């Protein structure tokens, strides 16, 4: 039955379950209310439930509420362990014209044209093990090169050096992105000093 499916999913999903997980499995969301009444899970945010062994995940909770926001810049660096800093704010990228409904205050929004909104998007686990959508390193570098003047100079230098030391560069992807984003020659000039 759908209840047995639901309970299997919770056990294998490390103690977090959402309304969207239910809709995806074809299970009425009121089943979560029933499990909450029984004490198996409890509600922490709108549509998000934890077991007694599930944990708060600020990145996953945020992207759950705002699924068009892709973690970018320092959030994308942090989530992929490309920096040692622990940011106290989110950097996200959304399509131009997107407005957040009741965002948190520790948020930097970056807008890009729809054609670029998912270029270099990839999925990685957060520090709490939940999958979120981020920009891969090559797309982060493109962003940094395009937007250098608007970026803290110490962060810019550190990030370029981190890519220089990154042993899993995908230069074909780097060049693909830079061509589409009209920044190939500045990216080639940047790469020259990092390899």
- In this structure, the answer to whether residues 51 and 70 fall within a common structural domain is no
Resolution (A): 1.8
Structure tokens belonging to residue 142? 């493109």
How far apart are alpha carbons 58 and 162 in whole angstroms? 25
Structure tokens belonging to residue 182? 């009209």
Q: How many CB atoms lie within 10 A of CB 50?
A: 19
- In this structure, the answer to whether residues 51 and 92 fall within a common structural domain is no
Helix (H) or strand (E) holding 12: helix 2-12
Point out the domain boundary residue: 55, 76, 100: 55
Residue 86 exposure: Cα atoms within 13 Å on the Cβ side: 2
- In this structure, the answer to whether residues 65 and 49 fall within a common structural domain is no
| Nearest CA among 56, 48, 73 for reference residue 134 | 73
Largest pairwise CA distance in the chain: 61
State how many domains the chain has. 2
State the structure-solving technique.
X-ray
How far apart are alpha carbons 85 and 39 in whole angstroms? 38
Q: How many CB atoms lie within 10 A of CB 145?
A: 22
Q: Which residues pair with 27 in a beta bridge?
A: none
Give Rg (Cα) of the chain. Answer: 19
- In this structure, the answer to whether residues 107 and 187 fall within a common structural domain is yes
- In this structure, the answer to whether residues 116 and 184 fall within a common structural domain is yes
Alpha carbon dihedral 28, 33, 34, 38, in 10-degree steps, equals 150
Q: Which sign, positive or negative, has the C-alpha torsion 41, 43, 47, 53?
A: negative
Give the contacts of 47 (CB within 8 A, at least 6 positions apart): 18, 19, 20, 29, 64
Point out the domain boundary residue: 55, 70, 95: 55
Quote the domain boundaries for residue 107: 59-194
Please return the burial class of 100, using the count of CB atoms within 10 Å of its CB with bins 0-12, 13-18 and 19+. middle
| Nearest CA among 119, 123, 125, 126 for reference residue 140 | 119
Q: Any idea what DSSP says for residue 102?
A: S
- In this structure, the answer to whether residues 7 and 89 fall within a common structural domain is no
């Amino acid at each position: 039955s759908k209840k047995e499916i639901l309970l299997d999913f919770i056990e294998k999903n490390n103690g977090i379950v959402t309304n969207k997980d239910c809709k995806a499995l074809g299970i009425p969301t009121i089943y979560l209310t029933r499990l909450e009444k029984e004490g198996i899970i409890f509600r922490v945010e709108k549509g998000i439930f934890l077991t007694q062994n599930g944990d708060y995940d600020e990145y996953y909770f945020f992207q759950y509420r705002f699924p068009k926001a892709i973690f970018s810049y320092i959030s994308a660096l942090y989530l992929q362990q490309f920096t040692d800093e622990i940011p106290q704010y989110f950097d996200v990228t959304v399509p131009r014209g997107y407005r957040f409904n009741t965002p948190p205050a520790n948020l930097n929004i970056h807008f890009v044209s729809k054609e670029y909104s998912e270029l270099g998007m990839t999925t990685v686990p957060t520090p709490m093990g939940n999958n979120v959508r981020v920009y891969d390193f090559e797309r982060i570098i493109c962003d940094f090169v395009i937007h250098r003047e608007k970026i803290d100079s110490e962060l810019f230098v550190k990030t370029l050096q981190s890519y220089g030391n990154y042993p899993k560069k995908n230069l074909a992807k780097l060049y693909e992105y830079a061509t589409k984003m009209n920044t190939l020659e500045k990216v080639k000039q940047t790469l020259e000093v990092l390899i």
